[PDB]
Write a protein that holds these residues in place. Structure first.
Motif, mmCIF file in Angstrom:
data_model
loop_
_atom_site.group_PDB
_atom_site.id
_atom_site.type_symbol
_atom_site.label_atom_id
_atom_site.label_comp_id
_atom_site.label_asym_id
_atom_site.label_seq_id
_atom_site.Cartn_x
_atom_site.Cartn_y
_atom_site.Cartn_z
ATOM 1 N N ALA B 61 0.856 -1.169 0.000
ATOM 2 C CA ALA B 61 0.000 0.000 0.000
ATOM 3 C C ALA B 61 0.893 1.219 0.000
ATOM 4 C CB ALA B 61 -0.904 -0.019 1.204
ATOM 5 N N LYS B 63 1.938 5.080 -1.595
ATOM 6 C CA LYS B 63 1.358 6.349 -2.044
ATOM 7 C C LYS B 63 -0.157 6.357 -1.802
ATOM 8 C CE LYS B 63 4.782 6.530 -5.677
ATOM 9 N NZ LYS B 63 4.929 6.745 -7.144
ATOM 10 N N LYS B 64 -0.990 6.644 -2.810
ATOM 11 C CA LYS B 64 -2.421 6.830 -2.581
ATOM 12 C C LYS B 64 -3.147 5.532 -2.207
ATOM 13 C CE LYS B 64 -2.932 10.871 -5.547
ATOM 14 N NZ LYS B 64 -3.960 11.702 -6.234
ATOM 15 N N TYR B 65 -2.495 4.395 -2.456
ATOM 16 C CA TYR B 65 -3.132 3.088 -2.232
ATOM 17 C C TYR B 65 -3.307 2.737 -0.757
ATOM 18 C CZ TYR B 65 -3.209 1.835 -7.206
ATOM 19 O OH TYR B 65 -3.462 1.808 -8.554
ATOM 20 N N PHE B 68 -6.930 2.124 0.469
ATOM 21 C CA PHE B 68 -7.610 0.846 0.293
ATOM 22 C C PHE B 68 -7.469 -0.106 1.491
ATOM 23 C CE2 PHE B 68 -8.947 1.448 -3.946
ATOM 24 C CZ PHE B 68 -7.931 1.991 -4.699
ATOM 25 N N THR B 92 4.433 -0.555 3.242
ATOM 26 C CA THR B 92 3.950 0.788 2.959
ATOM 27 C C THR B 92 5.057 1.809 3.106
ATOM 28 O OG1 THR B 92 2.211 2.438 3.470
ATOM 29 C CG2 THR B 92 3.141 1.220 5.352
ATOM 30 N N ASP B 142 -2.976 -7.997 -4.343
ATOM 31 C CA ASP B 142 -3.252 -6.571 -4.564
ATOM 32 C C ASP B 142 -4.119 -6.011 -3.430
ATOM 33 O OD1 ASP B 142 -1.898 -6.608 -7.055
ATOM 34 O OD2 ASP B 142 -3.647 -5.939 -8.162
ATOM 35 N N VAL B 143 -3.959 -4.713 -3.153
ATOM 36 C CA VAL B 143 -4.673 -4.040 -2.073
ATOM 37 C C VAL B 143 -5.981 -3.372 -2.489
ATOM 38 C CG1 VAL B 143 -3.609 -1.736 -2.250
ATOM 39 C CG2 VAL B 143 -4.261 -2.677 0.005
ATOM 40 N N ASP B 144 -6.132 -3.100 -3.793
ATOM 41 C CA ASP B 144 -7.283 -2.398 -4.345
ATOM 42 C C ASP B 144 -8.446 -3.355 -4.535
ATOM 43 O OD1 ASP B 144 -5.637 -3.560 -6.492
ATOM 44 O OD2 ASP B 144 -6.798 -2.452 -7.931
ATOM 45 N N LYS B 277 -10.744 2.247 -8.593
ATOM 46 C CA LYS B 277 -9.487 2.976 -8.377
ATOM 47 C C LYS B 277 -9.268 4.047 -9.451
ATOM 48 C CE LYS B 277 -6.422 -0.384 -10.697
ATOM 49 N NZ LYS B 277 -6.982 -1.726 -10.392
#
Ligand SMILES: O=c1ccn([C@@H]2O[C@H](COP(=O)(O)OP(=O)(O)C[C@H]3O[C@H](CO)[C@H](O)[C@H](O)[C@H]3O)[C@@H](O)[C@H]2O)c(=O)[nH]1
Ligand SMILES: O=c1ccn([C@@H]2O[C@H](COP(=O)(O)OP(=O)(O)C[C@H]3O[C@H](CO)[C@H](O)[C@H](O)[C@H]3O)[C@@H](O)[C@H]2O)c(=O)[nH]1
Ligand SMILES: CCCCCCCCO[C@@H]1O[C@H](CO)[C@H](O)C[C@H]1O[C@@H]1O[C@@H](C)[C@@H](O)[C@@H](O)[C@@H]1O
Ligand SMILES: CCCCCCCCO[C@@H]1O[C@H](CO)[C@H](O)C[C@H]1O[C@@H]1O[C@@H](C)[C@@H](O)[C@@H](O)[C@@H]1O
Ligand SMILES: [Mn+2]
Ligand SMILES: [Mn+2]
Lengths: 277, 277
Positions: B61, B63-65, B68, B92, B142-144, B277
């Motif tokens: 995760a 930056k912007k992620y 999520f 992160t 994946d986190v999204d 996203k």
């Protein structure tokens, strides 16, 4: 460590096209059930040759059953693990009655003199050390049999049993499990996945030693308690495989009796078959 | 060593009744393809609890992620390996942005600060020693994403990939493999089993370390040669899984996008799904 497969050209598996729609090809514990059409033998042969796999095959030929060895071995040479390293272990009370069978390259045969619990005991408590040094997998079969078609590395896995040809369509209540609670082989009428044939099981050496040790110990308990399971080592094999799920199951292609059961449409190949006894 | 399963009452599997007739449930190398209806989760839960299995779940995760993480983790608590030991590893650049999520018993979370090749490199060359000491299996996602339904021990195996939801019905020529022979990820038009999604793979720690090491090394070769594979780590994952066959394949139940693809009849459950996203 497993090296990379080489480039291979073969048909793409298609997710929305089953290999077989007429039979169960995976157990509820996610073990493959091995039928013709479920495997690409070229991929499997690559995988197992890249590990230089050695397969041991145990067979007992005691008293009159030495008569079955010539056909058993000659047909094993035609059909069993061809291209792979094979070590046959022939357990017999008559070493001189073992026929002289010509073997393909990379294949060897050892005659082991012996003289019920014998098969499970002999496989576990007698040959434990030897098998661990000499082979990667053990396959343990009846001798009153012949190979008619391919039996290869598709069977290999940590632990396998084979569906008994008389019971693959039967409900579990009809299975001839040991039903007396006084036996270690006891299975109640509401338990059981399959009825496995005592004449074809195997796995890694470690898992086969575990199975045969457990079955031998359970048979010894029964003997001390004055009970013999209805189908002897097969009853114990069934109890073991109920409580320790096999990682593959072989379809009845792998243990068939054509005289008794014919050639049903669901069997595309008859691979290993009963000889009249 | 694996202790015996206890007595269990469940429906008998029937050899002449497939679990699913609409989909391929085993690969040509005898790996189960995991769909709803193919497994009895009670048997599998027993097997894995008897081994006190610990599952690590890696997620990045950056930056912007980080936005999520809350939904990802809260829904993982509802659906991912419930009843088993779980260790989350959240990689992160913003440790302070990791939400404080309440965990069930036997579950823990570690925040690992970091700051492309990062995921493969970080999984292999950074955390190798730690994962080997702490978990039995690694699952890398994946986190999204969010969990909507059961994702459990049915996935666990030495090495697995997941069918990309856009390509499970596609012919191999349509797969977006890397097609330039100058890349280490190159796959010719006549090769390929499946298109695996980069956002959900896993296996034993040893097999995941092997995969991630190999992909990292292959990406480094490409970088030295001035080429970046079309789908980055996913291209390399696909090359690896072509040459090292996975021991299970997860159906697209396990990685779905409902906004893009709806809810086809072949999917009985949508387990792990894309978030906008
Ligand atoms: O004099 C002998 C007797 C046996 N054997 C050996 O034992 C194997 C099984 O016996 P068989 O095939 O007759 O029984 P099947 O009906 O085909 C096999 C079934 O019934 C058995 C008892 O007759 C057991 O209960 C077994 O567990 C079960 O599978 C046979 O292939 C020989 O390798 C030997 O070498 N000499
Ligand atoms: O700023 C970021 C960017 C990424 N990430 C991390 O990387 C994961 C994949 O990226 P994304 O889901 O956007 O691509 P998808 O389209 O869903 C995933 C696909 O496309 C990727 C590039 O966009 C890669 O090529 C990947 O291999 C392929 O599977 C994402 O879930 C985050 O855990 C992050 O933490 N911060
Ligand atoms: C004529 C005999 C019919 C036998 C059908 C059932 O097979 C027998 O099943 C037992 C378990 O209930 C045990 O496994 C022995 C098994 O009989 C053996 O295998 C059969 C397929 C035949 O080859 C038979 O000759 C052999 O004894
Ligand atoms: C609107 C976008 C349609 C994308 C369909 C194909 O999916 C993409 O496939 C690529 C391989 O060719 C790569 O795996 C990225 C993948 O796109 C991701 O996954 C999709 C299912 C969507 O969730 C998409 O938003 C995401 O970027
Ligand atoms: Mn027999
Ligand atoms: Mn994603």
């Amino acid at each position: 460590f497993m090296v990379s497969l080489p480039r291979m050209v073969y048909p793409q598996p298609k997710v929305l096209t089953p290999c077989r729609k007429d039979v169960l090809v995976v157990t509820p514990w996610l073990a493959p059930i091995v039928w013709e059409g479920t495997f690409n033998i070229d991929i499997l042969n690559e995988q197992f040759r890249l590990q230089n796999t050695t397969i041991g095959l145990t067979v007992f030929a005691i008293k009159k059953y030495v008569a079955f060895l010539k056909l058993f071995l000659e047909t094993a040479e035609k059909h069993f693990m061809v291209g792979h390293r094979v070590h046959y272990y022939v357990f017999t009370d008559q070493p001189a009655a073992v026929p002289r069978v010509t073997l393909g390259t990379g294949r060897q045969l050892s005659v082991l003199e012996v003289r019920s619990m014998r098969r499970m005991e002999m496989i576990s408590d007698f040959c434990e050390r030897r098998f661990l040094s000499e082979v990667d997998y053990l396959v343990c079969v009846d001798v009153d049999m012949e190979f008619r078609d391919h039996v290869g590395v598709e069977i290999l896995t940590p632990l396998f049993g084979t569906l008994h040809p008389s019971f693959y369509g039967s409900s579990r209540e009809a299975f001839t499990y040991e039903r007396r609670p006084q036996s270690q082989a006891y299975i109640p009428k509401d338990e059981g996945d399959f009825y496995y044939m005592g004449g074809f099981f195997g796995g890694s050496v470690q898992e086969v030693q575990r199975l045969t040790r457990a079955c031998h110990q359970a048979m010894m308990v029964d003997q001390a308690n004055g009970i013999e399971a209805v189908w002897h080592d097969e009853s114990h094999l069934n109890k073991y495989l109920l409580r320790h799920k096999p990682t593959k199951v072989l379809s009845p292609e792998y243990l068939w009796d054509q005289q008794l059961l014919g050639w049903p449409a669901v069997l595309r190949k008859l691979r290993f078959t009963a000889v009249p006894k």
